[PDB]
């Protein structure tokens, strides 16, 4: 099967439905909020690693707030829900990339393109590690520009999908027919 876990509501005013990472989650970086789009991106995607991690974060938060810690581990929940939280073969793909000798995902550092003015973010993706060191930002600069273009395309697409969802086709149809018939009237004039 695939993952089925859903993200708990997050108490972020700017981002109502998107998992916001608190001070404790991010090392020496205070609190950052991502938004509903970035976290909901991988409700169909099986090839992203960071949103699986934040699903792990939300599962931990649920297990703490709505159960009792008891000071001893309950591996039952994680062993049962691991296939419901994360993809099962993405780690296999990164293990294979590692064996072959191409840069693989670290799973500790993740990089994202924070939009300075508006504060949107791409869904963070793994910082490739190779040869026992971090890849220079120059090495995968091409991937950085590809992700920037992906952000642009995805935000310009989601608004289209929202417009399609709210606006029926009978409107844009009867609009183009009416404008065409008025253009015909101008032709007659």
């Amino acid at each position: 099967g695939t993952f089925t876990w859903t993200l708990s509501d997050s108490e972020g005013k700017d981002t109502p439905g998107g998992y916001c990472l608190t001070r404790w989650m991010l090392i020496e970086a205070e609190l950052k909020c991502f938004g509903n789009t970035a976290v909901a991106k991988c409700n169909e995607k099986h090839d992203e690693e960071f949103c699986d991690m934040l699903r792990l974060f939300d599962f931990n938060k649920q297990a703490i707030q709505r159960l009792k810690a008891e000071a001893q581990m309950s591996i039952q929940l994680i062993n049962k829900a691991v296939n419901a939280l994360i993809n099962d073969q993405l780690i296999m793909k990164n293990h294979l990339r590692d064996i072959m000798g191409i840069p693989y995902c670290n799973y500790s550092k993740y990089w994202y393109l924070n939009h300075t003015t508006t504060g949107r973010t791409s869904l963070p993706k793994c910082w490739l590690v190779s040869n026992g060191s971090y890849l220079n930002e120059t090495h995968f600069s091409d991937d950085i520009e590809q992700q920037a273009d992906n952000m642009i395309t995805e935000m310009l697409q989601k608004e289209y999908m929202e417009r399609q969802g709210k606006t029926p086709l009978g409107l844009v149809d009867l609009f183009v027919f009416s404008t065409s018939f008025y253009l015909i009237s101008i032709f007659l004039h």
């Binding site: 159960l67 039952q76 709210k166 409107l171």
Partner: protein, 219 residues
């Protein structure tokens, strides 16, 4: 050209009203030149799936009084799942390889109990489980004797994985019933409390062998 139905449902959005206004202006200009009800029509009609229609391919789970759970396979055979203080079995055996030697049992029931036993999270105490298979009868008893981290916890977990019918906290569950009984029975309509459903067994098939402990290096 079915805009009429949609228009009543959602005229609130500004873009729709702007579009309609522009269309009406263009049309006028060209002619001059020439119980549970939601929204307005949507209704909360509900379904009660008769799952007896799946009696020929899938086992169905339903219960009678929150203590007598059942699994029916076909229209001829089923099993009791009774939470009780009384033990029908007083020997700590499970003669599985003897059952396989004398293939006189029903394959469906043995697969049911195999799935049930391979889905018990972190099962490590084999003293609890007891079995009887003489004549093809399926009998399995469990001792729910116990702080948490006990085989009773996981065994109740897999019970409510299967039956889905049911003071414990932090993923630990306790019941006053000391024992549980699984045993062969015929088919009737004796599960007033719960509708029959197959989802318990299909879901239990997912987690089988997932949380099992290693007892040998080679396996």
């Amino acid at each position: 050209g079915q805009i009429v139905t949609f228009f009543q449902e959602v005229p609130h959005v500004i873009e729709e009203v702007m579009n309609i206004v522009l269309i009406a202006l263009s049309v006028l200009a060209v002619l001059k030149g020439l119980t549970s009800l939601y929204k307005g029509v949507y209704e909360l009609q509900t379904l009660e799936l008769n799952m007896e229609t799946l009696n020929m391919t899938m086992p169905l789970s339903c219960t009678k009084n929150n203590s007598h759970h059942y699994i029916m396979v076909g229209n001829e055979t089923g099993l009791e799942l009774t939470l009780t203080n009384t033990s029908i079995i007083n020997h700590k055996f499970c003669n599985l390889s003897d059952a396989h030697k004398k293939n006189l049992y029903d394959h469906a029931l043995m697969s049911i109990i195999s799935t049930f036993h391979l889905s018990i999270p972190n099962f490590n105490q084999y003293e609890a489980m007891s079995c009887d298979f003489n004549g093809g009868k399926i009998s399995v008893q469990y001792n729910l004797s116990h702080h948490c981290g006990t085989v009773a916890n996981g065994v109740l977990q897999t019970f409510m994985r299967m039956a889905w019918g049911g003071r414990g906290n932090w993923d630990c569950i306790m019941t006053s019933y000391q024992y549980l009984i699984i045993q062969n029975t015929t088919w009737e309509d004796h599960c007033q409390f719960s509708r029959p459903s197959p989802i318990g067994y299909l879901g239990l098939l997912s987690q089988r062998t997932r949380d099992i402990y290693i007892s040998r290096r080679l396996l």
